[PDB]
């Protein structure tokens with residue numbers, strides 16, 4: 001019989017990490033692996049029905065998505081939902097699926113609010129979530145002895161899925177819960193020169209350990225301004241929250257990363273400014289199955305989905321959809337083996353939560369709350385070359401920070417700055 005999967009993702013817009021053009025080829029690869037394992041889903045064939053989260057304007061919507069989920073639910077009685085990826089689409093869809101007691105799988109929806117599983121029942125997140133970044137910051141602060149204060153600056157585009165707002169919301173709640181520190185925050189608009197005076201005033205008076213969520217250019221600009229104001233690596237550290245690594249190039253091999261470089265006549269000043277800057281990204285999976293996945297994903301997307309998949313950290317999302325689907329397929333199989341059936345959402349979800357699995361993204365742990373443990377990398381500058389590289393990795397499960405390639409964290413004075421200045425703010 002059929003195990004029907006309902007997909008609510010962006011079907012025509014190709015610009016999201018969870019767009020169908022990237023997730024669809026990944027899902028196909030997953031279903032081919034399943035089809036070649038007869039021990040899986042004994043007497044059940046996975047079929048896919050598709051609905052779009054996009055409004056007329058072509059963006060993922062808080063309206064189009066639940067309307068589509070409702071339609072797919074009536075027409076197909078799906079055993080499970082795949083997606084949505086956008087916070088704004090996921091929020092209403094997840095409340096519906098919870099009410100239907102039908103499992104929803106996603107590698108998007110990183111927002112804090114989705115982690116409230118009393119509301120978002122049977123939602124399993126197999127991609128990153130923003131509280132996990134709070135875990136990473138928590139670890140950093142314990143490693144480096146920062147136990148009092150931090151400042152967060154963040155900005156977003158005109159009005160959308162507000163990635164940076166949700167990143168900060170996630171970071172703030174988790175960090176406050178575990179470290180009891182004071183976390184000042186401050187929103188700004190990127191294209192507005194009126195906002196810079198207040199940003200630089202806030203850096204001066206509100207913190208010394210500083211987190212910035214913004215476009216690569218807004219970060220560079222702020223660093224240049226910080227330098228000109230005599231705010232240097234001795235008293236300050238600036239973390240760029242750039243989870244998908246936009247400020248950095250991919251498939252570089254031995255070509256050194258110089259995120260401070262523009263050829264705009266400020267490169268020397270930028271390099272000098274970036275001595276005080278470190279970059280926080282998701283961890284690039286390093287296992288060989290992943291590189292094979294990327295090879296296969298690229299070929300399939302170009303062939304059947306009319307789309308060129310670029311190298312980048314964004315590709316972890318479709319791979320996590322891939323892995324999530326397989327984790328779900330294993331769970332259903334285990335449920336069938338012990339007398340259950342495919343529509344037993346609660347029993348299927350219990351078998352995914354608090355569990356380890358091996359997939360193209362490597363080792364993956366889903367925590368007790370149904371959210372994947374997320375790994376992070378910290379990049380900083382070789383003072384000799386100006387180049388950036390990964391110097392620390394964070395394992396989301398063990399909560400361990402490990403040195404990478406025997407590198408040392410760069411500090412101008414050889415030790416990190418205190419989070420409170422010796423004379424007060």
Ligand SMILES: *[C@@H]1O[C@H](CO)[C@@H](O[C@@H]2O[C@H](CO)[C@@H](O)[C@H](O)[C@H]2NC(C)=O)[C@H](O)[C@H]1NC(C)=O
Nearest residue numbers: 012013014015016057058059060157158159160
């Ligand atoms: C695909 O999605 C992107 C958004 O993720 C669309 O681009 C935004 O479009 C709105 C108007 O709808 C603008 O105000 C934003 O500033 C745009 N932002 C970005 C990031 O470009 C894009 O138009 C969509 N494309 C299609 C064909 O539907």
Ligand SMILES: *[C@@H]1O[C@H](CO)[C@@H](O)[C@H](O)[C@H]1NC(C)=O
Nearest residue numbers: 362363395396397398399400
């Ligand atoms: C992360 O730590 C966990 C828990 O010890 C371990 O299972 C896993 O193998 C680690 N991840 C990697 C990629 O080493």
Ligand SMILES: [Br-]
Nearest residue numbers: 053084085086
């Ligand atoms: Br979506």
